[PDB]
Design a protein around this ligand. Structure first.
Ligand SMILES: Nc1ncnc2c1ncn2[C@@H]1O[C@H](COP(=O)(O)OP(=O)(O)O)[C@@H](O)[C@H]1O
Ligand SMILES: Nc1ncnc2c1ncn2[C@@H]1O[C@H](COP(=O)(O)OP(=O)(O)O)[C@@H](O)[C@H]1O
Ligand SMILES: Nc1ncnc2c1ncn2[C@@H]1O[C@H](COP(=O)(O)OP(=O)(O)O)[C@@H](O)[C@H]1O
Ligand SMILES: Nc1ncnc2c1ncn2[C@@H]1O[C@H](COP(=O)(O)OP(=O)(O)O)[C@@H](O)[C@H]1O
Ligand SMILES: [Mg+2]
Ligand SMILES: [Mg+2]
Ligand SMILES: [Mg+2]
Ligand SMILES: [Mg+2]
Lengths: 35, 49, 446, 439, 97, 426, 443
């Protein structure tokens, strides 16, 4: 990785990486996403 | 990746047949080696054979 | 490309010839030298054929008569994709490698191999990555979404490549290329999608991109590598560093033999092709008798490229010996080679060359100025005029006129001396310079 | 699409069973006596009895010495080593010339060894492991591993050490591995091909399943040279600590290999030979332009030749009565000191004739896939006899290029004349060099 | 230590990353073993370095501190006047635009 | 101040028309040579040509080195200028041609612009992954760092409350020192204290640092990494320089061409000056002949004071100025002339006035006559002993007695040779 | 046939052919003739075997192919093994890493060896079945068994601390010294062979040692002085005994080793065996080398130096003048010269017969006579090679014995030096001249 990166201390899950074009900006499991 | 494709097919391990012995000076003593060679020569497997 | 200021052979663009190997009187930079040009064209065609190995041609003639110019012409007309290694005879004597080893490296550098492989590729716009944690049911539940110009599809990661996309910070909405077998991820920049979303990033992303076709295809990758690169690579643990540091250090012969056998097996297996390029040696008279003796045998090897030689002198004493030989070369090496001779230059040819140099250096010359330059070139030398023409440009600019006239050329001639005039002045006042025996007179009086 | 370089039109000595040399066979023409002598020499080499014999071929330039040596190498066969060298190649910079000469001397003799090995090759399952009952803080008594292969499966039990080796390899459960019980080393061949499509992507190559029985008994035969053993002992590659690998990182420069190491290697090789495991095969060391050697290497050759395992050395030289380089007042034949030529045998090579030159040109044209006329061939032969044999052979190719340019498949007289006018030889260049002001 | 602190100034004019690590062959992708590279880096990190301070002094250099007073003509006179004034127990108001 | 045989020469002293004034810029005479040097200077400033080669030839004490120094000083500090002597090319660890090519690469320069990102301030927490809670005097921010920079941090024995200074581009780490907040923890605490840095923790700067092609060639030829132990041992593994392959030079050329095409950098060719070229041998002359016909070579100027002499390395090859004829053919020769009485007197006066010395008219005339009779350099060098002799007598002005005593004390070459020939014991 | 020699140039020689009264027999042990030289060599061999004389220079001089190298090889063979014999040539002295004097000193040090004895005590046969159960791994006892002994040993804290590292499976034959050193792993008993199916890379099955548990043994090692210097020079110098990059060992190490060897000899732990340093082609050697030898011959730790040369009044390298045997008079003064004479016809015939017998070649009487005639007119080595060439000729003809026709065919197939010289002289134009003038064109 590129050395020296800025983080905001919020969330910051090293094993969770979610990236999209942000059309909904919602996790598929945010709160057991279903019905 | 292309060169390391026929390695084990025609390679003989030199260290196995005591041909790279130059490092055996590091951790082997003379009298222990002599005792091993004394208690080395067969005479046991042939019995079960 | 290849940002450069100027070269003494910058105007030469690949020899000049026809489809019948006939030389035009003036084409692509060089003029005259019709027989030498046709011989160079024949040599070039022989090189392009690639079915003949280890031929030695020696270009010989008086100095400043299109020898290095002809070499540059044949090198340029040969084009890329064919190796052309140009070296000087004085750079083989090194304190790190024996002259034989340096000559061997130069010979190996001039022959290349093209290795062709077939690989499947996955390309397209990625729109979303989803990554999970470690769970008993699955070590990592990750999915990738890919959008082409016509297809959208979902891929599932298998516990390793997620380290691939997390090793470097990648993000969606861009076109990437990933190899099934290799596993390398190449981010080509940023996709097109909506123009506004990537129109305010401050340039970057290499002028973005747009998806072209489908998801996965099958392509062919060809890698061109010189043989010497192969020996350096296989010599040490990390020889590709030595490809830049230059500390190979007399690679052993077993490596070379193994490379030869493996390359031959590839060639008759249809996995690689051979390009026999050209090795050119300037000022071959600077070599040694040992180097010539080694070349005598190195020429007859199967993987021997076409060798060109340039020398000036005639009937001189060869280095490393005590007898005088023609061209500064031994008799047997001369017998092994084919000689191409060059003649002097006509006044008309000198004028044409000077005009070409003028139009190359963006300098405008009046007709009388060109005539005076041609007269000086015929009187003294071509290179003196080819330097005076450039040096008079600054004098012309000092008068606030772009065109060069007779007065500028006269001023340049009277300002910058010449070999003959300098020799005459030295002989007239030899008591002021340092003598051969070291005796000097400095005091003006007495 | 086959490349040629001054050779490959010769493929043997052209000798019958009785050793009589046919006039035109194997690519050779003439030189009956030299071919017969070289056949006798190669027979002696095949006899595998002598040690240190020395042959030197004498003759003028372009007479067939190098061709004779390459014919000897071709006749010998690929198995027997044949190390070619040039005289100037011995002057190394990293190490003294004597060491390089000895290294090339030992590179000529070879050794064929054999070794029988067992091996085991799809992993089905593995279980690691009893009560300590002593000073064992963590005990792993044994590890049970099952393999699938193709011609039936089988399970077995194996030591904890090979289990730690597996963990170092870090193989999964659905994999194919390569375990050699001789050294107790496991090699991960890879995943299993039939285990594909578990995920949409996977970097690792899946690789098919091993064929045949899992428990394979086999034997291997390898040809090496004594120089390989010397290099392996001098610069061992094993080692895991920092010092060993960082020594491996530095460039490998030749050193002065001691005599004791060579003696120990010889003793070990002799012990293995006495058991019938391996057999030795002497080779040939070939040297070009021995006049490039100085007096020091020439003197050391006397000591090297009289050794016990010296190979057969073949030397080439074209000089007459010249001063041996390295000294200023020693006139010797072929530039070889009198003692050395007293130590060896001499084979003379005779110059060719017009008909032989014509036949050589015809053979080169045929092997080059070119078409020539009888009149053109006669003109080429006369040209060669006027200037040199090599000149016509070199000039053949540009004639072919010129013929191809005019859409004509046959070499003709005007093409040969045009090639003569376009390309000069040594004699004309010498005749036009001194008749000019600027060199 | 004092001499090496006072007389170590110069720094390289140009440096290229991904070359120091590639020199030893210890990188993400290399011909050396995946775990063999770990043993040597662990050993090297355990290895102490007595030349570290020279490394720091030869990589980044700071442009001193006192020269701020030196490099302005008015500041030297201001410092002299302020010292003379403070030594005599006075107080001052400074004005500027 | 300090003077050494120069620094009284401040330029070619030319006007806009290029005509050399008789006395200007610490120069007298040498009008034609000065005009030719000015023409060459304009040609260099054009930044179009490449590989142009001139040499200036004349007797000793005629101003060749002075002319080269004046050219360099008139060109300006922006343009690189590499001076050299013929004897430097005979190195020990690399071949002569490699050293010549190294100087060739060193001769030309490249001006580039770069952006540097910097972090600094007090450290609040340090937790292994490394996460650093930097806090400036106005802002606070947490950063994630690589293991290498973490190792550099550990080697700096940093702790909570230490103002530090990290650079993002290079990874360089420097602990500025303990924060001023904890200024009362030990009455004789040895650690120094520094106030918290001003501004936000993250800053960006734009710099126009210059470089040379040889600099960024040796950058990837051999590294000078820094604070990492692995980099230290890697740079310690090889302590000797080596010959650079042409492939590295080609890659450097491609990278530089891409940079200048992107509108981020510009190229400034320089000058390579070689004094006493007669020390070069035939092999170096041939290699320089080959290397001049390149597409990146700079302007090379050569100096020599020789007649028709034998080229070093050969037996009977005689040539003017000891330079092979083939290299002479691609050369531009600039003549240099000897001086006269009044010119010598003016030069002596200039050298006296630059050395803050007072010389009376009669002493100056005697010095000029001496310089004409023996040499110019001897008269120039005899000034300082005359000044000290005058000072010892508690005076300020040089007198005829002072120059006479200086003549008595010190000898020139002619009288030394005369006393050498007429003596028994060597 | 312990060595790997196939057939040497002179392998028929096994020692000097002399008897108890030192009188050389006419032919025995592969040597023929040279009675005076053989007697002198026997005297030299007696002197070196005596071991009470240090630093003697003997020089063997004679025309080429008269047995100088053969005489030295015979002396080396008769001296037997266990005595160092360092054989070198002059050209090997000039090195690119070491000076001439350093290489000469290393050769001198290699030439003489020392026998060093060492007394040690061991315990072997650790088929244990340990018994360890207070706290902190108490109950420090373990059994030891062998063929004739069996006993239980208690353990200490440091002993168990050593035992836990390098774990012993309680059924493996292990050894340990009472010198407060390290316990050494030896092997595994045969009872645990069938247990697994794939043994490791460090496991062997040694039988149970017999005798007594506490054994005491003396071992004698033969080490050259140069080996000791190399070992003590660096941290790990023994590797340089194979790579060869010793790098000019300093004088302090050498004098320290000299003092150590003197102390060892005084204490009776070591004894010095002098050897012989043989130098072929000593004529080619720099004046610096002779200057160094002149002083190195006078050291107490100096071997017997044999030199060989075959030059007349020739120029010594590194100088401008001519001296006999290519050696300075200063060095020639401190030496004794053994001169070898030319060979007789009958001696040549006997040598040829012996060499043919060595190669299992059956010569006819007339073939042997013709070979002797050729070896008398030409050199001897020419005929010596001709015998093998003619044997190959005859074998190609399907006939075991070699006849006159085969010998004549071999003679006319391979050229003697004189005939080649004559042919070169008669055809000077075809060969490349001293000035590089050749005539390739045939017309
Ligand atoms: N036929 C030609 N066309 C154009 N330029 C030429 C020609 N022949 C020579 N030149 C000029 O001569 C110079 C090269 O001279 P060259 O023949 O290389 O000298 P040398 O033979 O001594 O190496 C170049 O600057 C080139 O412009
Ligand atoms: N008897 C022959 N038959 C066929 N070709 C020959 C014969 N003699 C010589 N040649 C050819 O002549 C060429 C050059 O001869 P070469 O052996 O190189 O001469 P030299 O002995 O001086 O090295 C070789 O390519 C070889 O093919
Ligand atoms: N025109 C001039 N004006 C002033 N000083 C000069 C002039 N020309 C030469 N000199 C002086 O002469 C001395 C010799 O000059 P320099 O070029 O260094 O050596 P050389 O002239 O022998 O090559 C220098 O110290 C210089 O100061
Ligand atoms: N007395 C002898 N007994 C056996 N062989 C001998 C004898 N004298 C000479 N020879 C033979 O001569 C050869 C040795 O020649 P030598 O005189 O050593 O040559 P040089 O004088 O050049 O060293 C050996 O091959 C050996 O077979
Ligand atoms: Mg040229
Ligand atoms: Mg040949
Ligand atoms: Mg000067
Ligand atoms: Mg001998």
């Amino acid at each position: 990785k590129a050395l020296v990166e800025e983080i905001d201390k919020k969330t910051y899950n090293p094993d969770i990486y979610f990236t999209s074009l942000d059309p909904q900006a919602r996790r598929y499991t945010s709160k057991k996403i279903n019905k | 990746k292309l060169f390391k494709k026929n390695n084990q097919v025609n390679r003989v391990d030199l260290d196995f047949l005591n041909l790279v012995f130059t490092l055996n000076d590091k951790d082997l003593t003379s009298y222990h080696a002599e005792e091993i060679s004394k208690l080395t020569c067969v005479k046991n497997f042939v019995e079960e054979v | 490309k290849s940002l450069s200021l100027i070269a003494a052979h910058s105007h030469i663009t690949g020899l000049g010839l026809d489809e019948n190997l006939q030389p035009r009187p003036t084409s692509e930079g060089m003029v005259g030298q019709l027989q030498a040009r046709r011989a160079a064209g024949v040599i070039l065609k022989m090189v392009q054929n690639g079915t003949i190995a280890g031929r030695a041609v020696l270009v010989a003639g008086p100095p400043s008569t299109g020898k290095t110019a002809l070499a540059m012409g044949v090198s340029q007309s040969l084009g890329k994709d064919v190796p052309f290694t140009a070296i000087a005879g004085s750079e083989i004597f090194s304190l790190e490698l024996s002259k034989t080893e340096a000559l061997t490296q130069a010979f190996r550098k001039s022959i290349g191999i093209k290795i062709k492989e077939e690989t499947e590729l996955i390309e397209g716009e990625v729109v979303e990555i989803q990554i999970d944690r470690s769970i008993t049911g699955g070590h990592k539940q990750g999915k990738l979404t890919i959008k082409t110009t016509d297809m959208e599809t979902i891929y599932e990661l298998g516990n390793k490549m997620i380290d691939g996309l997390t090793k470097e910070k990648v993000l969606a909405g861009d076109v990437i290329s990933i190899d099934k077998a290799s596993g390398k991820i190449t981010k080509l920049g940023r996709s097109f999608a909506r123009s506004r979303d990537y129109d305010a990033m401050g340039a970057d992303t290499r002028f973005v991109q747009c998806p072209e076709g489908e998801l996965q295809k099958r392509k062919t990758v060809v890698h061109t590598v010189s043989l010497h690169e192969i020996d350096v690579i296989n010599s040490r643990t990390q020889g590709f560093l030595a490809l830049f540091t230059g500390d190979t250090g007399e690679i052993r012969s077993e490596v070379r033999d193994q490379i030869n056998t493996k390359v031959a097996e590839w060639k008759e297996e249809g996995k690689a092709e051979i390009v026999p390029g050209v090795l050119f040696i300037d000022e071959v008279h600077m070599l040694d008798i040992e180097c010539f003796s080694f070349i005598n045998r190195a020429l007859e090897d199967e993987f021997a490229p076409i060798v060109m030689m340039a020398t000036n002198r005639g009937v001189s004493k060869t280095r490393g010996t005590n007898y005088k030989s023609p061209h500064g070369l031994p008799l047997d090496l001369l017998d092994r080679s084919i000689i191409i001779t060059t003649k002097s230059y006509n006044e008309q040819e000198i004028k044409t060359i000077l005009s070409i140099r003028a139009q190359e250096e963006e300098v405008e010359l009046s007709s009388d100025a060109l005539d005076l330059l041609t007269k000086t070139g015929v009187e003294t030398s071509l290179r003196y005029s080819s330097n005076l023409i450039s040096v008079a440009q600054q004098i012309a600019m000092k008068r606030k006129n772009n065109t060069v006239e007779v007065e500028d050329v006269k001023r340049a001639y009277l300002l910058f001396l010449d070999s003959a005039r300098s020799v005459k002045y030295v002989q007239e006042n030899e008591s002021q310079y340092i003598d051969d025996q070291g005796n000097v007179q400095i005091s003006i009086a007495k | 699409v086959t490349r040629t370089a001054a050779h490959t039109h010769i493929k043997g000595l052209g000798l019958d069973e009785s050793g009589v040399a046919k006039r035109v066979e194997g690519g050779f023409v003439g030189q009956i006596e030299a071919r017969e002598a070289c056949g006798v020499i190669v027979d002696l080499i095949k006899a595998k009895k002598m040690s240190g014999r020395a042959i030197l071929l004498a003759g003028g330039p372009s007479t067939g010495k190098t061709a004779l040596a390459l014919a000897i190498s071709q006749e010998l066969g690929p198995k027997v080593p044949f190390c070619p060298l040039v005289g100037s190649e011995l002057y190394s910079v990293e190490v003294k010339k004597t060491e390089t000469l000895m290294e090339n001397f030992r590179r000529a003799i070879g050794l064929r060894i054999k070794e029988t090995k067992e091996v085991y090759e799809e992993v089905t399952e593995l279980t690691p492991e009893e009560n300590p009952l002593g000073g064992y803080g963590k005990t792993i008594s044994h590890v049970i591993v099952g393999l699938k292969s193709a011609k039936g499966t089988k399970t077995l039990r194996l030591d904890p050490t090979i289990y730690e080796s597996i963990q170092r390899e870090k193989v999964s459960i659905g994999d194919v591995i390569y375990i050699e019980a001789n050294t107790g080393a496991v090699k991960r061949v890879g995943r299993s091909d039939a285990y594909a499509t578990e995920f949409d992507l996977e970097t690792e190559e899946y690789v098919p399943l091993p064929k045949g029985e899992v428990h394979k008994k086999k034997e291997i035969v390898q040809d090496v040279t004594l120089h390989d053993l010397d290099v392996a002992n001098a610069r061992p590659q094993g080692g895991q600590d920092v010092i060993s690998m960082m020594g491996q990182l530095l460039k490998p420069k030749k050193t002065e290999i001691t005599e004791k190491l060579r003696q120990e290697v010889n003793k070990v090789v002799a012990k293995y030979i006495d058991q019938g495991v391996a057999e030795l095969i002497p080779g040939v060391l070939f040297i070009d332009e021995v006049n490039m050697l100085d007096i020091e290497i020439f003197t050391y050759l006397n000591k090297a030749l009289e050794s016990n395992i010296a190979p057969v050395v073949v030397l080439a030289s074209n000089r007459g009565m010249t001063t041996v380089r390295g000294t200023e007042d020693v006139i010797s034949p072929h530039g070889v000191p009198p003692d050395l030529i007293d130590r060896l045998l001499i084979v003379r090579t005779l110059p060719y004739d017009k008909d032989e030159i014509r036949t050589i040109i015809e053979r080169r044209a045929t092997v080059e896939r070119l078409q020539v006329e009888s009149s053109a061939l006669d003109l080429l032969a006369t040209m060669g006899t006027e200037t040199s044999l090599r000149y016509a052979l070199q000039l053949l190719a540009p004639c072919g290029i010129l013929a191809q340019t005019s859409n004509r498949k046959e070499i003709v007289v005007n093409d040969v004349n045009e090639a003569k006018l376009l390309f000069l030889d040594a004699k004309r260049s010498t005749k036009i060099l001194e008749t000019s002001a600027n060199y | 230590r004092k001499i090496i602190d006072t007389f170590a100034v110069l720094t390289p004019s140009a440096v290229s990353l991904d070359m120091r690590k590639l020199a030893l062959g210890l990188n993400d992708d290399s011909s050396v073993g995946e775990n063999t590279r770990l043993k040597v880096m662990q050993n090297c990190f355990e290895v102490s370095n007595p030349l570290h301070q020279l490394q720091t002094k030869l990589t980044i250099a700071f442009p001193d501190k006192s020269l701020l007073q030196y490099d302005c003509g008015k500041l030297q006179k201001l410092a002299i006047l302020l010292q003379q004034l403070k030594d005599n127990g006075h107080r001052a108001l400074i004005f500027t635009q």
